Design an enzyme around this catalytic site. Structure first.
Site, PDB file in Angstrom:
ATOM      1  N   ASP D  19       0.916  -1.381   0.253  1.00 42.51           N
ATOM      2  CA  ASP D  19       0.179  -0.078   0.247  1.00 42.51           C
ATOM      3  C   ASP D  19       0.878   0.740  -0.373  1.00 42.51           C
ATOM      4  O   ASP D  19       1.893   1.398  -0.258  1.00 42.51           O
ATOM      5  CB  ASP D  19      -0.862  -0.103   1.575  1.00 42.51           C
ATOM      6  CG  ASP D  19      -0.232   0.026   2.669  1.00 42.51           C
ATOM      7  OD1 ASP D  19       0.830   0.679   2.681  1.00 42.51           O
ATOM      8  OD2 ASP D  19      -1.067  -0.680   3.708  1.00 42.51           O
ATOM      9  N   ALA D  20       0.570   2.046  -0.184  1.00 44.11           N
ATOM     10  CA  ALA D  20       0.549   3.611   0.107  1.00 44.11           C
ATOM     11  C   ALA D  20       2.068   3.772   0.866  1.00 44.11           C
ATOM     12  O   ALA D  20       2.044   5.412   0.905  1.00 44.11           O
ATOM     13  CB  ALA D  20      -0.042   4.746  -0.075  1.00 44.11           C
TER      14      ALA D  20
END
EC number: 3.1.2.28
Lengths: 144, 144, 144, 144
Positions: D19-20
Site C-alpha cells: 500500500d501507499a
C-alpha cells in the site's frame, strides 16, 4: 454529533467477495474492517490527507504511521452475495501509543462474524513508537 | 540466457481467485499479468529495488514511474481452481517512453484468455514523460 | 424513477486500494466497475437472488450466467486514497444475448479513468448462448 | 517423501501486495497463508478436484466443506515489495472434525509475521459437522 453516526455502518456483500464455496472468502472480512475504520474516521470528520499516505491534498506526508500489529476474526455464520451487513465498531485506546477496534457484523439481526484489529503509532521515518495523532485521539475519545 | 526462461512462466489458479460462479473472477487475470511481468523482470536479472517503490534495498526511491495507461483482456474459456496455466509474455517497445506487454494464458494447450497492458514512463516527481529506465530497456531488447 | 438514481453512483478510494507508488493500483478499477454494476441493478430494483449465484435467498441457483468476455480501461489521471469518485454508467444492449457497460470515473469534475465490460448470456449448465435474463433486459431498457 | 517438501514453501512479495505506506497491506498475509496451504496439499500429492469446489476435473462437487472459523496474525517486521519470504507451515489436528495451520514468514532469516487459521469440517449441503476428508487426514498425519 451522536457516535452511532460514525460507529454504525453498513455494507452490501458483492459477487467478487465470494468464492466457489458460494460464500464470502474469509480474508475479505479484514478488508471490510479496514475500510469501515476509514469510513468511521471520515464520518466523525477527520481529513484523509492528515492520516493516510497517498492522499491527494496532503501538504506533507503524514508523520505518524499506524501499522497493524495484530488482527483476528471469528466466523460464525455464512455470509452471502447481496447480504446487507450492519457493522458496529467499538474502538479502545490501549495506551498513549496504541489502540484497537472491534468490528461486529450482523445480518438479519444475527452476528455472522466479528474481528479485532490492533494498531501501534510509530514515526513513519524512524519507526520508533510515538504518540497517537491528535485526530485519532479525538475520535477515540468521542467514541467512548 | 534463452528468453523463454523469463517469458514463459507458470501459475496455478487458487481457490480465492474464484467466485461463486465456480470459475476465476475476471479481474484476477490482471493481477496475474502484473505479477508475471514482475517475475519476468526478476528472471531476466533486474533488481526490484531499482524499479519498484516500496522495496527493501532501494538506496533512493526509483526516479521513473511506469504507470499503466491502458489495459484490456479477452476471456475465451473458463478458468478453474487448481488449473495449471502456462503464461507467455510478449513485450513491445512502443517508443522511447512507452512499452506494452501481451500475456497469453493456456490451459491444457488451449488459449483460455489473453491480455495487454500498456505503460508510460514518467518522472515520479514531476509526472512528465521521460525515457524508459535502462533496465527495462535491456529487458525489452533481450525479449525481442 | 429517474435513471440517474441507478446510473450515477459514488465511491471513496480506500487506503488498501493504493500501492507503494502512492496511487490506486490499476486493477482495482475493474472491481469498482463490477461492484457499481451490481449497485446499479440493486438501485433499479432487481433482487440479487435472481441474478447472482451465492445469494442467500435464491430458491434455485440462477439459470443464466453473465460471463465477462472482454474488458478494458484507460487511466488518464492519478487516483488517490480518500478521493471521492463520481461514477457514471452507460449500458448498451448489443444483441439479444449480450450487453456492455461503460464506466466513467470523475474526480473534481475531471475524468480520471474509464472502462468497458462486455458480457455474454449463457445457460449456466450447458454454457450455450442464451437470451438475457428478463430483469437485465428491463434494466437495459430503463437505462436507454 | 520428506515433509519439508510440502511444509517449507517460498514466495516473493509483489508490487500490488503493498500500500501507499510502502509495505505489505496487512490482509494480504491471509491470502498468502491460504494459498500456501493449497500449495502444501498439492505438493504432498492431493488432487484439487477432491477437496476444492470450482475445480475443472471434479466428478462431483466435493462433499465436505472446510470453512475457516477463526484466524489471526501478528505482524512483527515490515514486509516489502520484492522480499523473498520463507514460509513454514505447521498443521495440527484438533479433533476428528477440525484442524489448524500455523504459518511462519521469515525474511533474511528473521520472523516478519506469523498467522494461524482454524478450519471445521462440515457437510457442504447440510452444514453439519462431519469427519475430516481422508486426504486431509493423510496430510495431517504425514505432517506430524
Amino acid at each position: 454529533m451522536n457516535p452511532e453516526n460514525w460507529l454504525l455502518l453498513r455494507r452490501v456483500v458483492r459477487f467478487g467477495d465470494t468464492d466457489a464455496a458460494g460464500v464470502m472468502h474469509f480474508h475479505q472480512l479484514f478488508r471490510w474492517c479496514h475500510e469501515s475504520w476509514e469510513e468511521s474516521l471520515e464520518s466523525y470528520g477527520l481529513n484523509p490527507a492528515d492520516i493516510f499516505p497517498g492522499s491527494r491534498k496532503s501538504e506533507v506526508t503524514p508523520e505518524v504511521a499506524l501499522p497493524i500489529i495484530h488482527c483476528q476474526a471469528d466466523f460464525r455464520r455464512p455470509i452471502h452475495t447481496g447480504d446487507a451487513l450492519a457493522m458496529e465498531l467499538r474502538p479502545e485506546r490501549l495506551n498513549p501509543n496504541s489502540f484497537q477496534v472491534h468490528f461486529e457484523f450482523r445480518c438479519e439481526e444475527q452476528i455472522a462474524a466479528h474481528a479485532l484489529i490492533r494498531h501501534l503509532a510509530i514515526n513513519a521515518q524512524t519507526r520508533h513508537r510515538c504518540a497517537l495523532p491528535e485526530g485519532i485521539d479525538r475520535w477515540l475519545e468521542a467514541s467512548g
